[PDB]
Amino acid sequence: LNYSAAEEFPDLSKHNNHMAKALTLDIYKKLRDKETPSGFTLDDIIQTGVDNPGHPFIMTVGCVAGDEECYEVFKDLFDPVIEDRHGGYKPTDKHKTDLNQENLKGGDDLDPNYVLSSRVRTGRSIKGIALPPHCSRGERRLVEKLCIDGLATLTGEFQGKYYPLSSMSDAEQQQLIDDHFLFDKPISPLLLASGMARDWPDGRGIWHNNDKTFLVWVNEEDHLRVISMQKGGNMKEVFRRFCVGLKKIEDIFVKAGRGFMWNEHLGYVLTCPSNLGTGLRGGVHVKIPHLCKHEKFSEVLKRTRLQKRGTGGVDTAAVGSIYDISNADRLGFSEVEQVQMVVDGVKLMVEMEKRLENGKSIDDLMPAQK
Amino acid sequence: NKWKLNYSAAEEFPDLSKHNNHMAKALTLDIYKKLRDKETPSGFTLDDIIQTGVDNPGHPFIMTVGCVAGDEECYEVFKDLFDPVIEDRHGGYKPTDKHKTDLNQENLKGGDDLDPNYVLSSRVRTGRSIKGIALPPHCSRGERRLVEKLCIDGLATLTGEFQGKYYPLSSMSDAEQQQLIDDHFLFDKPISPLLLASGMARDWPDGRGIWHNNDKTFLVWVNEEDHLRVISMQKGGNMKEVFRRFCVGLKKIEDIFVKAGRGFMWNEHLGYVLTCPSNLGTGLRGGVHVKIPHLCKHEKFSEVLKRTRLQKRGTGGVDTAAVGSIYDISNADRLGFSEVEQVQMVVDGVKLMVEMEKRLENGKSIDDLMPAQK
Ligand SMILES: Nc1ncnc2c1ncn2[C@@H]1O[C@H](COP(=O)(O)OP(=O)(O)O)[C@@H](O)[C@H]1O
Ligand SMILES: Nc1ncnc2c1ncn2[C@@H]1O[C@H](COP(=O)(O)OP(=O)(O)O)[C@@H](O)[C@H]1O
Ligand SMILES: CN(CC(=O)O)C(N)N
Ligand SMILES: [Mg+2]
Ligand SMILES: [Mg+2]
């Protein structure tokens, strides 16, 4: 620290990123000497943002949390970043958590002729343990054990087994990856620069019930990545299992003195500020050859508050007209609200694909902006 | 460290069961237990040191060290780990041994003859660290910028054959950068698994750059794997001319920094201190790009390499494969010999490999040419 704040201030002149848009010399001056209980610092928080400039078109977050205290100790940086990334979400705003699956209306009849799969995923962090960008091998192992012992008490349809990555051949791994069940080794320079790939494979693995309809990714982007999924369109069932399983897992952890990080302002606390509130991304793999090329496709996603992406075959990668359409919201909307927008929006897109196949217009179906 | 202290040495001890790297061969639980709570004046810890070796269990083309130093004192404070690592990687260099420099080109015998039909290029490089500034795996942006400043000012005073300009990576277009890379002058994109896992890629390209003369025969990499990497190179096999330019420019550089009150990290035992333990001592890696279609496929290629103490790398550097049968052959050990003795080894070994390729072209035996393990 024999160097001034200005001498140590990152060169962000060519950066396109939330962290870069928020950070100023004053904030750096005031916070560069602070640290969280686990020793995480502002430099640690912004490192990924300094290394990954991102692109003008897409705006990346550019910063991560190394532990729970980061969001309070470095609020001068996270607050404006969160506000900007989350659409105006203010430090005083509160986030509503709703995991009551009975509040969802319909969603069990999505067209199986267009909707090949349905999936609802979220992330969780364990109180008292540093997050992936900063967690020690010991901490990571602690989380792993907690899941192993905790999940081993799940019964019935939630009866399952844990497979540490170290127990799977590179071949078995690829198969699990190809079938959309398992996460691969991080490659994203955004991820790698945060330090979350450390000691990789150690402490990582996957737990899943026998039917592989309920899964828990262990120590990948976050402490826990809980997933519920099936082929088809009953999203209702998917969410149902999601909520029931989630609650079973929370009850066990809470009982073990290790609960999930949460607060009334950010909801569930996770590594990346973009995934705060709910750690939820509910979506379907759907075939929309006509719609994906319709001039209005971009406007419908915006109005339905949905997002698109790519994983082409429910098996195969980058083929066909099979898209991954999911909710865009994270914080400010409740789990039920997000999955409800997925159900409604996906149902409308299907209704649109069909019209487009018949060469008819879709102006008739254009939703209103949500 | 106070936070990890909440966990036992065993809970934090890395699983190196499937690892190959010098760090893994040496690191024991006892050593981890005793050093896990230490730190250097700049804040570097045992975990920081070994991180690259825990992340990188192997390497596609060579045997790696698997640890790095974040500052000068790492080698002393974490002696228990670096000492056997150093003895393993450099053959048998003992912690009680002392390093000796020789920069005097005159002591180099021959080497101005390399069969130009086989040796496409000759190069001699070394690294230097600046006293009082943390090493790349751990340096702050302010520290990195101070190194760049010292280099710009310091190197700007060279003249004539060494007159040069400094080009910061940020002043270079992506195309200019890749040209410099394709031409083997500039360090590659930050892609080396070591550079990445050790934290040496932080804030890239901020503070990085290359300085060189108009002829591009004498260059200095600024802030890459080390503060400075001083290079001398040219197409062809006149290994002696390369080394002369090497010693002369380097000696000049060292005097300029000394005069500016900036000296380089040096100790009686490890010689020149650099990031990777493999680069300590002379920090010199002298070699050539040679075309050995036959020998490289011969079942005794690896053995010839070991007996001669030479290391093979790809045509585009340690992180690449050999292309068009063109291998980067250089001295593999840097502690235990001087720059003259090491450069003499590449010279002798390469001539012998040429002679070896000639045998094989004629379908001859090379068994008689296999020298005793030096
Ligand atoms: N609706 C879905 N149905 C089946 N598999 C899916 C679905 N959505 C995502 N996946 C799979 O999950 C894996 C991770 O995809 P990715 O976009 O990173 O997802 P996430 O961020 O939600 O974890 C991939 O194998 C992907 O194909
Ligand atoms: N003998 C040589 N002649 C020309 N270029 C070389 C030679 N040896 C190595 N290089 C080049 O130097 C660059 C750095 O390669 P690397 O293995 O990382 O070396 P170093 O040990 O100097 O860091 C590469 O572009 C490589 O092709
Ligand atoms: C390839 N290296 C040696 C090693 O990894 O052992 C470098 N760059 N220090
Ligand atoms: Mg993912
Ligand atoms: Mg190199």
Q: What is the CATH number of the domain that holds A102?
A: 3.30.590.10
Whether A162 and A53 map to the same domain: the answer is no
Residues with CB under 6 A from ligand 1: A 117, 119, 121, 180, 229, 281, 283-285, 311, 314, 324
Answer yes or no: is the C-beta of B278 below 6 A from any ligand 3 atom.
yes
Distance from CA of B61 to the nearest CA of A (A): 21
Please say whether the beta carbons of A127 and A261 come within 8 A. yes
- On the 0-12 / 13-18 / 19+ scale of CB atoms within 10 A, B39 is middle
Which residue bears the tokens 């509160």?
A: A94
Answer yes or no: is the C-beta of B285 below 6 A from any ligand 2 atom.
yes
- b/e map of B85-103 (b: 16 or more CB within 10 Å)? bbbbbbeebeeebebeebb
Please say whether the beta carbons of A132 and A196 come within 8 A. yes
Note whether A138 contacts B: Cβ–Cβ < 8 A: yes
**C-alpha triplet B23, B25, B29: angle, nearest 5°:** 85
Rounded Cα distance between A264 and A267, Å, is 5
Rounded Cα distance between B315 and B292, Å, is 12
Q: For residue A201, is the peptide bond before it cis, meaning its omega torsion is within 30 degrees of 0?
A: yes
The neighbouring-strand residues paired with A217 are A206, A225
The CATH number that applies at residue B21 is 1.10.135.10
Q: Which of A29, A48, A51, A187 to mutate to test the interface with B (most CBs of B within 10 A)?
A: A51
Ligand approaching nearest to the C-alpha of B285: 2
Please say whether the beta carbons of B170 and B206 come within 8 A. yes
Of B337, B286, B275, B268, nearest in space to B130 by CA: B275
Note whether B4 contacts A: Cβ–Cβ < 8 A: yes
Ligand approaching nearest to the C-alpha of B186: 2
Instruction: For residue A325, report the distance from its CA to the centre of ligand 1, in Å.
Output: 10
Rounded Cα distance between B330 and A326, Å, is 54
Rounded Cα distance between B200 and B203, Å, is 9
Instruction: For residue B184, report the distance from its CA to the centre of ligand 2, in Å.
Output: 6
Instruction: For residue A180, report the distance from its CA to the centre of ligand 1, in Å.
Output: 6
DSSP per-residue letters across B18-49: T--SHHHHH--HHHHHHHTT---TT---HHHH
Please say whether the beta carbons of A99 and A246 come within 8 A. yes
φ and ψ at residue A214, rounded to 5 degrees: -135, 120
Please say whether the beta carbons of B308 and B374 come within 8 A. yes
Whether B146 and B288 map to the same domain: the answer is yes
The alpha-helical segments, DSSP class H, found in chain B are: 9-12, 22-26, 29-35, 46-55, 74-77, 79-89, 141-155, 174-182, 193-197, 239-259, 301-308, 339-361
Chain centroid to Cα A369, Å, comes to 24
Whether A125 and A8 map to the same domain: the answer is no
Rounded Cα distance between A133 and A219, Å, is 11
- On the 0-12 / 13-18 / 19+ scale of CB atoms within 10 A, B373 is exposed
Of A273, A209, A214, nearest in space to A70 by CA: A273
Please name the member of B3, B14, B140 whose beta carbon is closest to the beta carbon of A199: B14
Whether B348 and B220 map to the same domain: the answer is yes
Are B142 and A11 inside 8 Å of each other by CB? Answer: no
Q: How many other C-beta atoms are found inside a 10 Å radius of the C-beta of residue B355?
A: 13
Residue of chain A whose alpha carbon sits nearest to that of B10: A138
The total of structural domains in chain A comes to: 2
Q: Report the binding-site residues of B for ATP.
A: 121-125, 184, 229, 285, 313-318, 328
Note whether B268 contacts A: Cβ–Cβ < 8 A: no
Nearest CA to ligand 1 atom 6: A180
Please say whether the beta carbons of B140 and B292 come within 8 A. no
φ and ψ at residue A28, rounded to 5 degrees: -65, -45
A309 is in an annotated binding site: yes
Residue of chain A whose alpha carbon sits nearest to that of B200: A193
φ and ψ at residue B125, rounded to 5 degrees: -130, 160
- On the 0-12 / 13-18 / 19+ scale of CB atoms within 10 A, A10 is buried
Q: Which residues of B touch A141 (CB under 8 A)?
A: 11
Dihedral Cα B358, B361, B363, B369, nearest 10 deg: 20
Note whether B183 contacts A: Cβ–Cβ < 8 A: no
The alpha-helical segments, DSSP class H, found in chain A are: 5-8, 18-22, 25-31, 42-51, 70-73, 75-85, 137-151, 170-178, 189-192, 235-255, 297-304, 335-357
Rounded Cα distance between B114 and B238, Å, is 6
State how far the alpha carbon of A113 is from the alpha carbons of A118, A278, A285, A358, A362, in Å.
Answer: 13, 30, 11, 16, 20
The β-bridge relationship of strands A115-124 and A224-231 is antiparallel
Rounded Cα distance between A142 and A124, Å, is 15
Of A87, A82, A118, A184, nearest in space to A326 by CA: A118
- b/e map of B48-80 (b: 16 or more CB within 10 Å)? bbbbbbbbbbebeeeebbbbbbbbbbbbebbeb
Rounded Cα distance between A237 and A221, Å, is 26
Rounded Cα distance between A48 and B236, Å, is 43
Of B198, B199, B206, nearest in space to B149 by CA: B206
* Sequence-distant (≥ 6) Cβ neighbours of residue B147 within 8 angstroms: B130, B133, B139, B207, B222, B223, B227, B228
Of A64, A91, A118, which marks where a domain is finished?
Answer: A91
Tokens of B337: 């010999």
Backbone φ/ψ region at B115: left (φ over 0), alpha (ψ -120 to 50), beta: beta
Three-class SS of residue A254?
helix
- State the sign of the Cα–Cα–Cα–Cα dihedral B102, B104, B107, B108: positive
Of A161, A167, A162, A249, nearest in space to A210 by CA: A161
Which residue bears the tokens 């799977």?
A: A168
Position B216, amino acid? K
Rounded Cα distance between A46 and A66, Å, is 11
Q: For residue B205, is the peptide bond before it cis, meaning its omega torsion is within 30 degrees of 0?
A: yes
Whether A359 and A219 map to the same domain: the answer is yes
Please report, in angstroms and rounded to a whole number, the separation of the first and last CA atoms in chain A.
49
Chain centroid to Cα A313, Å, comes to 21
Whether B176 and B85 map to the same domain: the answer is no
| Experimental resolution (Å) | 2.1
Three-class SS of residue B266?
strand
Tokens of A368: 């209103």
Residue of chain B whose alpha carbon sits nearest to that of A203: B15
Residue of chain A whose alpha carbon sits nearest to that of B191: A189
Please report, in angstroms and rounded to a whole number, the separation of the first and last CA atoms in chain B.
43
Answer yes or no: is the C-beta of B276 below 6 A from any ligand 3 atom.
yes
φ and ψ at residue A356, rounded to 5 degrees: -70, -25
Rounded Cα distance between B123 and B289, Å, is 8
Of B213, B210, B231, nearest in space to B222 by CA: B210
* Sequence-distant (≥ 6) Cβ neighbours of residue B61 within 8 angstroms: B312, B313, B314, B318, B319, B320, B321
Please say whether the beta carbons of A271 and A222 come within 8 A. yes
Are A10 and B206 inside 8 Å of each other by CB? Answer: yes
Nearest CA to ligand 2 atom 16: B317
User: Which structural domain range is residue B53 located in?
Assistant: 1-95
Of A71, A91, A111, which marks where a domain is finished?
Answer: A91
Q: Which of B118, B123, B274, B319 to mutate to test the pocket of ligand 2 (most atoms within 8 A of CB)?
A: B123
Distance from CA of B174 to the nearest CA of A (A): 14
**Maximum distance among all Cα pairs of chain A, rounded to whole angstroms:** 71
Please say whether the beta carbons of B212 and B166 come within 8 A. no
DSSP state of B68: -
Inter-helix orientation angle A235-255/A137-151, to 10°: 110
Of B109, B113, B130, nearest in space to B122 by CA: B113
Q: How many other C-beta atoms are found inside a 10 Å radius of the C-beta of residue A260?
A: 20
Instruction: For residue B317, report the distance from its CA to the centre of ligand 2, in Å.
Output: 5
Nearest CA to ligand 2 atom 11: B184
Whether B42 and B115 map to the same domain: the answer is no
Whether A27 and A171 map to the same domain: the answer is no
Strands (E) in A172-331, as ranges, are 205-209, 214-218, 224-231, 262-263, 267-268, 281-287, 306-310, 322-327
Whether A287 and A358 map to the same domain: the answer is yes
Of A25, A15, A23, nearest in space to A76 by CA: A23
Whether B104 and B169 map to the same domain: the answer is yes
Rounded Cα distance between A211 and A154, Å, is 14
Whether A34 and A161 map to the same domain: the answer is no
Of B63, B95, B127, which marks where a domain is finished?
Answer: B95
- On the 0-12 / 13-18 / 19+ scale of CB atoms within 10 A, A143 is buried
Note whether B33 contacts A: Cβ–Cβ < 8 A: no
Please say whether the beta carbons of B147 and B275 come within 8 A. no
φ and ψ at residue B267, rounded to 5 degrees: -145, 150
Rounded Cα distance between B353 and B357, Å, is 6
Whether A172 and A270 map to the same domain: the answer is yes
